[PDB]
Ligand binder design. Structure first.
Ligand SMILES: Cc1occc1C(=O)Nc1ccncc1
Length: 434
């Protein structure tokens, strides 16, 4: 009870103080054969986190307990070592345990996860880590346990969280949590759908008034905060939720047009308005793949796509390189999606939606690569390199399927590989003689 609480308090200290385990997931996995009983005392944990002391817990150790708690909850639910330690056939008794564990952590965390979110509402890192939990719930128990009350509680708290936060980690964690609760059962489906589309509506109104405030305006620092703040939330959700019924593309399109014309739109507002527009378009495509869509259906989406390909192209010329990257990424996505590939799986109705990038665009997709993939000059650089890598791999796809001139490409890859082709073999010797 407090005998387990001491063992957990010390286990959190051995993790932080000793870089003998870097990764929580890996620590827990290693101790799992040997200390399963302790690592699934979930009441003991939620207690430590929620209770006031009689030695108090410091911000950093709390964070660590929460991260270890989630890792235990996974390993119990999945009943297999995490990604990186995997090698998968359970015995009668292993399976029987998995079922009993899942029941325990669900019954428990349904009750307690709302209270954890409550208490730690402003700690983005903590909230995002906590919201990884419902994915492991036996969601049917929101009916079985007559536990309707606690589902309202969770939803009340996910509201507070979205209303308080703008970090893309938190928001995404909030979007995924809805997707999980929202479609997993029918019993609960209806309830969640309502909470969601209320949450949305509130943020579309704010966004829309915020858009108007800004474009009508001299433009206040607040005018800029309000537009961005709301957009971010809607962009986050628009990935896994189909918000097409609210014409978001419309207002994003204006934001982007104003930033090109008068050239004075904040860089984060542009990037978000780009991403949000893209998500608008993919969900427009999905409805039009699955329906039996008419002529005008197609042609109205086409104009939307060309008017947007235009915006992304123009946005390559934005001063702020983050814009350029977003611009580029969406161009290299969209040009691939709205290729002739779109007439695979018998879907040759979609011919009018196909796009071939003109010369001027192809040349600017060659530009960016020389200017922003292949550049002259800690952990911010290994993360920066993997991105230019993705920007290039996304550009690679366009070259292979002849959507940009495959020879103009090759000549840039020639130019920058020059020293590998000129002096590489003489480097080869070196790393076999030293
Ligand atoms: C670091 C590196 O990256 C690519 C090539 C090399 C390289 O040549 N390293 C080296 C040269 C001479 N002695 C020892 C090592």
């Amino acid at each position: 009870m407090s005998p387990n609480g001491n063992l957990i308090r010390m286990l959190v200290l051995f993790f932080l103080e000793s870089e003998l385990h870097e990764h929580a997931a890996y620590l827990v996995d290693s101790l799992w054969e040997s200390s399963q009983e302790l690592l699934k005392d979930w009441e003991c944990m939620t207690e430590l986190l929620l209770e006031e002391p009689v030695e108090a817990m410091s911000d950093r150790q709390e964070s660590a307990l929460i991260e270890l708690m989630v890792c235990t909850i996974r390993q119990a639910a999945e009943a297999h070592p995490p990604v990186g330690r995997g090698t998968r056939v359970l015995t009668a008794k292993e399976r029987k345990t998995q079922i009993d564990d899942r029941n325990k952590l669900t019954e428990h965390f349904i009750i307690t996860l709302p209270m954890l979110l409550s208490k730690y509402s402003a700690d983005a890192e903590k909230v995002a880590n906590l919201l990884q939990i419902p994915q492991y719930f036996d969601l049917e128990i929101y009916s079985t346990g007559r536990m309707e009350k606690h589902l309202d509680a969770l939803l009340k708290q996910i509201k507070f969280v979205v209303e308080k936060h703008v970090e893309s980690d938190v928001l995404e964690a909030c979007s995924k949590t809805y997707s999980i609760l929202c479609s997993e059962e029918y019993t609960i489906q209806n309830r969640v759908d309502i909470a969601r589309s209320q949450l949305i509506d509130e943020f579309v109104d704010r966004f829309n008034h915020s858009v108007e405030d800004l474009l009508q305006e001299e433009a206040d620092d607040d005018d800029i905060y309000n537009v961005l703040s709301t957009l971010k939330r809607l962009t986050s959700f628009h990935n896994a939720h189909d918000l097409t019924k609210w014409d978001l593309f419309g207002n994003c399109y204006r934001l982007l047009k104003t930033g090109i014309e008068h050239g004075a739109m904040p860089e984060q507002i542009v990037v978000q308005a780009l991403q949000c527009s893209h998500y608008s378009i993919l969900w427009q495509l999905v409805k039009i793949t699955d329906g039996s869509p008419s002529k005008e259906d197609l042609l109205v989406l086409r104009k939307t796509v060309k008017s947007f390909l235009a915006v992304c192209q123009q946005c390559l010329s934005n001063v702020n390189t983050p814009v350029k990257e977003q611009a580029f990424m969406l161009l290299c996505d969209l040009l691939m999606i709205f290729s002739h590939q779109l007439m695979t799986g018998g879907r040759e109705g979609l011919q009018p939606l196909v796009f071939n990038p003109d010369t001027g665009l192809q040349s600017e997709l060659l530009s960016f690569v020389m200017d922003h993939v292949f550049i002259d000059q800690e952990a911010n650089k290994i993360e920066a390199l993997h991105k230019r890598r993705n920007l290039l791999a996304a550009f690679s796809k366009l070259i292979i399927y002849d959507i940009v001139d495959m020879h103009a490409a090759a000549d840039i890859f020639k130019h920058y590989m020059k020293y590998y082709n000129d002096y590489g073999d003489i480097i080869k010797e070196t790393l076999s003689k030293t």
